Symmetry: C3
Subunit: 137 residues, 3 copies
């Protein structure tokens, strides 16, 4: 090979510490693989109260802090996977999702799973690409 690709563990105390043997995200070259985020408060380590709407907000806030630690924001996200405890929460989740993904909407997969870590109602993973990016048509 002509290059040694730079791999970095992304880590920020403003998102919850890992609850298992994983990194919050891994950057390799320009691609950031972000772990599935759940609605855990970064301080208490427990899910925020209030159900799917509050959990979704917290999960996206956690994702935002991980992106920021990699020098990115939500405009760098190119793909997400939205894992739901209840498919009937899709409309509620989409409204919250739109508060964070305001442009350049990522590709997405969404589905209801049988269960999530910690009894969460939502988990969101993502792939982001470090800028600069040029958005054409």
């Amino acid at each position: 090979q002509g290059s040694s690709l730079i791999r970095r563990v992304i880590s920020t105390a403003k998102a919850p510490g890992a609850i298992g043997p994983y990194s919050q995200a891994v950057l390799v070259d320009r691609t950031i693989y972000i772990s599935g985020q759940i609605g855990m408060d970064p301080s208490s380590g427990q899910l925020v109260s209030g159900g799917v709407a509050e959990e979704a907000k917290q999960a996206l806030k956690n994702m935002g802090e991980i992106l920021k630690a990699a020098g990115c924001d939500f405009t760098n996200v190119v793909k997400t996977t939205v894992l739901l405890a209840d498919i009937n929460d899709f409309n509620t989740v989409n409204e919250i999702y739109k508060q964070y993904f305001k442009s350049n909407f990522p590709a997405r997969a969404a589905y209801q799973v049988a269960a999530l870590p910690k009894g969460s109602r939502i988990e969101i993973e993502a792939v982001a690409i470090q800028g600069p990016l040029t958005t054409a048509s």
Copy 2:
């Protein structure tokens, strides 16, 4: 960085319009992240009739139109995820899958989920790489 990577929202009217805040696919540099495709008719916005076999055909047709809009075909796909409402549909789905993936078979994950958007019986996401590609051994 020495380059600004080109990010493009892939969009074609020959696949159904987005049912939420997502793009049909996002191309960034050479990598295309394709959203989970379900068996929705691009005109009516509703699932085709007939169950998993017809839905799988339509989902793959939708994926094919998105690939074509990115200057690709199914030979550019390197990974898929096949999400099933019923794991017992795997054999039926595989026969249809083979009508579209004729060579250079993608890596794949497959599993049964609890529920899919719109009560779909199958959702297929994919990663593709824009050519030219040289397939070695």
Copy 3:
């Protein structure tokens, strides 16, 4: 384009032959997309006996052989998805996972699905990046 990216089907007889129309992994440029691995013995084609712990070990061994065939080991893995038949197996699976992922922990998503191929209790997919890699901070 200024380059034709090299795409290679990764194949090793030390991991089970494909049970459907997929490749064990696909390498394209430097990125390896590894199919969901289940606890199948490479010789018998059947799941190993003993439940989730033995299946997880076998699935990771299978993944290790695929990585080795691509000139990689577990340190090249940057993202995994751990699909469980039972979320309550997470702690057991994590202990086994740690026997293979000893450093540079991948990003991860984990959740319980409704069912897996062959009645498996665990399926693990992964993305790896071919070296050389330089791990910074």
